Each structure stands twice: as C-alpha cells, then as structure tokens.
C-alpha cells in the first residue's frame with residue numbers, strides 16, 4: 001500500500017524531536033533519517049562488508065560491530081572518504097527508509113529529516129511540516145541542551161539552510177519559540193488534517 005508521508009524539518013534546536021514525540025503520542029510511526037543512517041551500519045548490515053574492503057578489515061571489530069570512533073577519525077583526516085562513504089550509504093539509506101515506511105501501519109508516517117531542504121528531500125514527501133523558532137531560540141536552546149558556546153552554535157546555523165529557505169518549502173509551520181505546551185494543541189490540529197489527507201490522497205481526483 002502507498003503510505004502518506006509528512007516530512008518534518010527544522011534547524012538545530014527548533015523542536016524536531018519534541019514535535020516528533022507529540023505525533024508519536026497520537027499513534028503515528030516516526031521514521032527518523034538519523035536513526036536510518038545508524039541502522040545501515042548495524043552489525044551484519046551489507047555496508048559493513050564494503051567498509052571493511054575499502055578502509056581495512058580492522059574497521060569492523062571481532063564481534064561484527066563497526067568501530068565507529070575509528071571510522072570517524074579516519075574520514076575526518078581524509079576528506080574525500082566522507083564522500084566515498086556517503087555514496088556507498090546513500091542507496092542503502094534510501095532502501096531502508098522505504099522499507100520502514102512500508103512497514104509502518106499508522107494512518108500516515110512522520111519522516112524526520114534534518115537535511116530536508118539541504119538535500120532536496122521534500123521532493124519525496126507528500127506534505128512538508130517545518131518546526132520554526134527564532135535564531136536566538138536556536139542558540140539558547142542548543143547551548144543549554146548540548147552545553148556548548150553561542151559561537152559554536154552560530155557556526156552550525158551558518159552551515160545549515162536558513163530559516164527562510166525552510167519556510168519557502170513548508171506546507172505547514174509549527175511555532176515553537178513560545179510555550180512548550182502549545183505544541184500539543186498545534187500538533188493535534190495538524191494531525192486531524194493529516195488524517196484527512198491520508199485517507200483521501202490515493203483517490204483524490206484533483207489537487208488539494
């Protein structure tokens with residue numbers, strides 16, 4: 001069956017995790033792009049064999065686990081490797097993402113993609129939801145949460161797509177720079193619409 005996909009995105013410290021949990025409490029399966037990226041290098045995964053062939057047998061421990069720290073340290077001191085690794089992992093992530101989408105039984109799925117705008121992944125979503133906050137909120141909330149400096153987070157903000165680039169592709173926007181508890185009511189409203197969209201998308205004769 002064709003699953004209805006709502007993609008969630010937002011910059012660092014905007015509320016991706018918080019919003020995702022709100023949808024999960026309503027019974028929606030969350031498919032998280034960062035979890036998928038870790039899944040494709042889990043013990044026994046096909047990517048591990050290719051990684052051992054390219055980087056050396058010792059990239060994989062005796063117990064079949066990827067030596068994460070060891071890979072990170074190799075790729076960081078060999079820039080093009082990041083690109084080699086991403087190319088290897090890309091198709092595998094696409095397949096695992098679809099498999100999980102296929103495996104989810106909720107009325108629609110929430111696909112959480114930090115790099116949605118950067119990687120133009122909104123082209124694979126039926127609906128785009130952006131959790132939005134002010135840049136200052138991103139700074140204060142990320143600093144607190146990760147115990148890092150303001151300047152450190154300012155660099156992440158300048159590396160990520162901008163606030164406006166995200167709003168340009170959004171179908172819906174949830175504001176999180178206010179009270180944490182206005183989240184439940186806004187998510188319920190969006191969920192109600194998403195149930196309708198998902199229930200009629202397959203037969204919907206004309207657009208919206």
Ligand SMILES: Nc1ncnc2c1ncn2[C@@H]1O[C@H](COP(=O)(O)OP(=O)(O)O)[C@@H](O)[C@H]1O
Pocket residue numbers: 010011012013014015016017018019141142145176177178179180181
């Ligand atoms: N409305 C809010 N007010 C204050 N803190 C919040 C609010 N919403 C979420 N948080 C916190 O802000 C931080 C960043 O939110 P989070 O969802 O983790 O961000 P990200 O978008 O990076 O996933 C977290 O520690 C979270 O608990």
